[PDB]
């Protein structure tokens, strides 16, 4: 689990710092490769960031902003690839790392291994305690095809800086220590060489290496230019298919592999979609739809079959919240591609408020591919039961890039997400819900699908208070796990279910309309089965599955009346056909 996803929060204040630190830790601890963006913002003076130690690779941009920490241990960060860029220009942005309007603020970038930026520049502004930043030969770190990269570095301070250690080859370091010298890997090489470990031809890295190397060959790179194929840097992964040399039929390559980030993988990671093209993604490629085989992307046979979009997608890409202008856009939808967010502006902006009953559109919703975010929600509604049949929030898109379920500041008394069995990825953040019990009631363990996931939770109704009012799970709920009060909110029913009510026994032996049991569901015996005494009443739903007929039998069926096709009661009660026409 060298691999995590980053976040996509930019400069946004976390709704709660307490949880912000926990998320950061959960997200990054043990992580070596960040897919997406490494964003470290609003971190207090007292913050232990050792969980960051192991990061060697950042696919998107790195942003260290609005922090009071004196240091962030990214000493092992080797390459940032700049796949996405901050303010569309920057692969590394270090901003406003100094106290609110001893003392606080980041002192030294400490990026001693940072030896490759593939795309995008560097933005270092308003860092009052920060020294050294203007000492680095960015020219070296930027890739050969990235010199045109923007660099905008501010050296206004608030402490007087001493020069780099005399031990550092030119003026160049990441910090004060003889251990902090910039090692140069591009400007210092023999002939037309992209990367090296020293001034000699023999010091030259393979052409497939990205940040330096420890030897001359494609197995010795500090990072891959493109793809890491089983510890060997390669331009591209092996194709999922070989072609017949005469016919050109697809033949499976046993060596074939999918590209996941800058890696070659035998199988897409759990929550990603496999492509026909041999890649792993989170949205399908053009004229390609998803199917379940696990989840693949294929070519649409007939022209791509239309779909229902959530926020973050299509005409709703730059749309904030679900509002009275777009809510009916979800009428009838089983599956929303993208997200749903309810914010104050959703209810009480001159824009007409969502009335609670409009919300009912979501009754058919079973899957959100994106996230679910709730930061306002009708007082009159005690739960999320409009989402009762929501089975799976996949989190291929994450609120702030971090959370796939968010519930904050809501008024709700319980969750009622009684169908939800998966949080594909992302974290769950349930904070500041005054009256909300039945949170530590849900076996979060079971919804999560990777170890980077957890439930982050504060300022909801204190648990002893919930019990003090007598608000536990119902008896009939297996293992004390539920989404809210009463026999309809169990995670797994411990006995039998009639409809959606978890019940003690089905009416198999006793009780007004008799029943049989199919996989723990109580289903009605056909009304024409004679309820039996001391024995079962039927074997299934049909009128030929009775032990005995309540009235007559037109074999194989028990029936109310003989049909009048004109038939008449036998003496034994079975319908014979009338002999006259």
């Amino acid at each position, epitope marked *: 689990t060298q691999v995590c996803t980053g976040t996509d929060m930019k400069l946004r204040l976390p709704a709660s710092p307490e949880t912000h630190l926990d998320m950061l830790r959960h997200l990054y601890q043990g992580c070596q490769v960040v897919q997406g963006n490494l964003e470290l913002t609003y971190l207090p003076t007292n913050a232990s960031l050792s969980f960051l130690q192991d990061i060697q690779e950042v696919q998107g941009y790195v942003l260290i902003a609005h922090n009071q920490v004196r240091q962030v241990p990214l000493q092992r960060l080797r390459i940032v690839r700049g796949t996405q860029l901050f303010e569309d220009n920057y692969a590394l942005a270090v901003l406003d790392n100094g106290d609110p309007l001893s003392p606080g603020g980041l002192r030294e970038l400490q990026l001693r291994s940072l030896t490759e930026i593939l795309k995008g520049g560097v933005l270092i502004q308003r860092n009052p305690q920060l020294c050294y930043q203007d000492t680095i030969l960015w020219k070296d770190i930027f890739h050969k095809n990235n010199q045109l990269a923007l660099t905008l570095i501010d050296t206004n301070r608030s402490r007087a800086c001493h020069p780099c250690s005399p031990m550092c080859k030119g003026s160049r370091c990441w910090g004060e220590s003889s251990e902090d010298c910039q090692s140069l890997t591009r400007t210092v090489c023999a002939g037309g060489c992209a990367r090296c470990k020293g001034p000699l031809p023999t010091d030259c890295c393979h052409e497939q290496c990205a940040a330096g190397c420890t030897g001359p060959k494609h197995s010795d790179c500090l990072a891959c230019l493109h793809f890491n194929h089983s510890g060997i840097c390669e331009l591209h992964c092996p194709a999922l298919v070989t072609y017949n040399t005469d016919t050109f039929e697809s033949m499976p390559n046993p060596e074939g592999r999918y590209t996941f980030g800058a890696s070659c993988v035998t199988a897409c990671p759990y929550n990603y979609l496999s492509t026909d093209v041999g890649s792993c993604t989170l949205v399908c490629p053009l004229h390609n739809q998803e199917v379940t085989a696990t989840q693949r992307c294929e070519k649409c046979s007939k022209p791509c079959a239309r779909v229902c979009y959530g926020l973050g997608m299509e005409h709703l890409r730059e749309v904030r919240a679900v509002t009275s202008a777009n809510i009916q856009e979800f009428a009838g939808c089983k599956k929303i591609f993208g997200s749903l967010a309810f914010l104050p502006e959703s209810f009480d902006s001159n824009t007409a408020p969502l009335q609670p009953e409009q919300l009912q559109v979501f009754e058919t919703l079973e899957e959100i591919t994106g996230y679910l975010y709730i930061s306002a929600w009708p007082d009159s509604l005690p739960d999320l039961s409009v989402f009762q049949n929501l089975q799976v929030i996949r989190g291929r898109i994450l609120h702030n890039g971090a959370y796939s379920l968010t519930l904050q500041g809501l008024g709700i008394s319980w969750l009622g997400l009684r169908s939800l069995r998966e949080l594909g990825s992302g974290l769950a953040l349930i904070h500041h819900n005054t009256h909300l019990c039945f949170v530590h009631t849900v076996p979060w363990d079971q919804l999560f699908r990777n170890p980077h996931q957890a439930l982050l939770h504060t300022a909801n109704r204190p648990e002893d208070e919930c019990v003090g009012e007598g608000l536990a799970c119902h008896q009939l709920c297996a293992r004390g796990h539920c989404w809210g009060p009463g026999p309809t909110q169990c995670v797994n029913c411990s006995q039998f279910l009639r409809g959606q009510e978890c019940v003690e026994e089905c009416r198999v032996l006793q009780g007004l309309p008799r029943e049989y049991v199919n996989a723990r569901h109580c289903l009605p015996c056909h009304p024409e089965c004679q309820p039996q005494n001391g024995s079962v009443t039927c074997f299934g*739903p*049909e009128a*030929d*599955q009775c032990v005995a007929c309540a009235h007559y*039998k*037109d*074999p*194989p*069926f028990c029936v109310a009346r*003989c*049909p009048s*096709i004109w*038939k008449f009661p*036998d003496e*034994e009660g*079975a*319908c*014979q*056909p009338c002999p006259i026409n």
Partner: antibody
Amino acid sequence: EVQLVESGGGLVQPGGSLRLSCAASGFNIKDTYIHWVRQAPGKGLEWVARIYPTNGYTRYADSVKGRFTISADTSKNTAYLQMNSLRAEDTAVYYCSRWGGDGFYAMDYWGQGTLVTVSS
Amino acid sequence: DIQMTQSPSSLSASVGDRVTITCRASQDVNTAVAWYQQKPGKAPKLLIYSASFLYSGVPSRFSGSRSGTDFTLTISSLQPEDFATYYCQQHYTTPPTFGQGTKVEIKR
């Protein structure tokens, strides 16, 4: 005339699947039970499955339960037998039949049959 | 699971003959018994239902009776077209079951 047409017959590899189809013509399948009945070469008639399309309630012979799946598509007026995990025992002519009528539980109409032949 | 024992498994009769085909039910089946005729490479066709009722457009030469659990198909004046396999079926319970069939051959 009422009419029931089987299709989908042909060679299956042992272990393989196959989907038989029965298009009804001249009555609605929702109004009755549809059975599939099969006949190995030179052997008797063997009831396989029945479906009641109004509610999709099914019943199955022991020799097929878990492999074969009966189903209906009311819009297409068509019944199906989804035959999974076939073996040489299963080589037979598959007919489709109804219990035409609501107090008439004899099989009044039958399709022409499709030969399924299970073989490597 | 109601079994239907059909005998004989095959018979030879000539044109004009009165042929009889029996079938015993393993348990009580009331009147829920049907008779089918299958001809070389054809679907079976229904002859008799509810034990003794001539189906629409079947020659009156075909007759069915019950005598307890024994059920009898009678072809009363065998004709050449009557060359076929004949099958009782019970539908008293589900599953419905077929007899083994009895082959009628014509002696000319």
